[PDB]
């Protein structure tokens, strides 16, 4: 009526457990080899005698007269890096200045080009991720920039995280303090005329916390031109003003120590040519600015909760509309589950008291190369850093229909959103508990 028979052993009734597990010493040796914990074979047999493979011949038979089903809970555990190549978090296109030249007697010829910089897999934490990006902009300048004109003064594109506009005085037209108040509010990206960044093929966008208000329109390009209204205002010549006590004030600090120009639009304007995203969003025209088509969001280092799909092709019936095949990247799905990664949050009031000390701690100002320029400076570390953290996930799918004849060797397969094994799985295993559902 509801048996469960196996080769030659006492028949069992009503229910039991078949175990899908990678570890088994025997099968690892033989079976999987060129496989990994995301696409492997395993014997469900569990009987000490019998050579695996020869096991493959045997079968667990759930009484034929009834349609069976089984509860499938699984234990999935990864250890995927915040920033890696497979997830698309190690690359990102941006347009920078390539050459600054003296041409055809009087012309200033500026040549800009798009280029894709890559990051060294792993390096978690958001802030640091920013830094690694800024550094990659530089590392490039080091291989092309300088040796083709282009000064530091005109480095296009830099990810910062502050509100260049806190000091700002509605009359002066300047950041009175003479310094862009060094506190971190949200990541944003700053651009110089003519350049900009593109994330079309990168989840890092999600790390900065900047998304399109219309996601499905593939094409994340944020040009200098887009950051309308909201160019970082200029600094008051704190020195002049004070010593001068008319009043100098109108004097908008044009350079800095080591004399770098703050590219001011004209000898008059209080504004600089440096455009900030964060500004355009909440300080620019809400109806036509950038706030119109992009959204200011919480960072999230994981870069985006993605899901993984399970499949047990040789043991569960194929769900409603999937068709059975043998193409690993199209197997039927039997369970979906978010990919095991969380955002742990911490507190480091030590940030920026630490950037200050961190710089001495790290024997180099590698990230802060321009410790004077109020722009190109090293963005403030925000209190509350986030870090992707891997965690085992004791998930639980529902009862799923089973085949009344379970093969000795079952194939287990965890796929990702785009349907492809996921290299970062360290442990995957599931427990199935069959039971009756109705009869034929």
């Amino acid at each position: 009526r509801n048996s469960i028979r196996y080769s030659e052993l006492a028949p069992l009734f009503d229910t039991t457990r078949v175990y899908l597990v990678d570890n088994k010493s025997t099968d690892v040796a033989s079976l999987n080899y060129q496989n990994d914990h995301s696409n492997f074979l395993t014997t469900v047999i569990q009987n000490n005698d019998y050579s695996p493979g020869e096991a493959s011949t045997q079968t667990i038979n759930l009484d034929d007269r009834s349609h069976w089903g089984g509860d499938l809970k699984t234990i999935l555990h990864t250890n995927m890096p915040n920033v890696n190549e497979f997830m698309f978090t190690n690359k990102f296109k941006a347009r920078v200045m390539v050459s600054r030249s003296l041409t055809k007697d009087k012309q200033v010829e500026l040549k800009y080009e798009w280029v894709e910089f890559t990051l060294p897999e792993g390096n978690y934490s958001e802030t640091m991720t920013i830094d690694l990006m800024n550094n990659a902009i530089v590392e490039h300048y080091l291989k092309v920039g300088r040796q083709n004109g282009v000064l530091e003064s005109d480095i296009g594109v830099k990810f910062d995280t502050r509100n260049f506009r806190l000091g700002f005085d509605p009359v002066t037209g300047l950041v009175m303090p003479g310094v862009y108040t060094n506190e971190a509010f949200h990541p944003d990206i700053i651009l110089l005329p003519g350049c900009g960044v593109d994330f079309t093929h990168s989840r890092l966008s999600n790390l900065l916390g900047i998304r399109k208000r219309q996601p499905f329109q593939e094409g994340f390009r944020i040009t200098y031109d887009d950051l309308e209204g909201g160019n970082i205002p200029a600094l008051l010549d704190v020195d002049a003003y004070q010593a001068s006590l008319k009043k100098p004030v109108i004097k908008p600090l044009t350079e800095d120590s080591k004399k770098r120009s703050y590219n001011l639009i004209s000898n008059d304007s209080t504004f600089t040519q440096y455009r900030s995203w964060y500004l355009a969003y909440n300080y620019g025209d809400p109806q036509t600015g950038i706030r119109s088509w992009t959204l200011l969001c919480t960072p999230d280092v994981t870069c985006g909760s993605e899901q993984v799909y399970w499949s047990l092709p040789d043991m569960m019936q194929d769900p409603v509309t999937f068709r059975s095949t043998s193409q690993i990247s199209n197997f039927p799905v039997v369970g979906a589950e978010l990919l095991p990664v969380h955002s742990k949050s911490f507190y480091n009031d030590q940030a920026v008291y630490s950037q200050l000390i961190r710089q001495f701690t790290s024997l180099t100002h590698v990230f802060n190369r321009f410790p004077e320029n109020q722009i190109l400076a090293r963005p403030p570390a925000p209190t509350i850093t986030t870090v992707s953290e891997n965690v085992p996930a004791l998930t639980d799918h529902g009862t799923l229909p089973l085949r009344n004849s379970i093969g000795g060797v079952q194939r287990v397969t965890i796929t990702d959103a785009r349907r492809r094994t996921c290299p970062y799985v360290y442990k995957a295993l599931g427990i199935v508990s069959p039971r009756v559902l109705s009869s034929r």
Partner: peptide, 10 residues
């Protein structure tokens, strides 16, 4: 007669 509204001294 302009208040910068900022304690520059300290």
């Amino acid at each position: 007669t302009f208040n910068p509204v900022y304690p520059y001294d300290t």
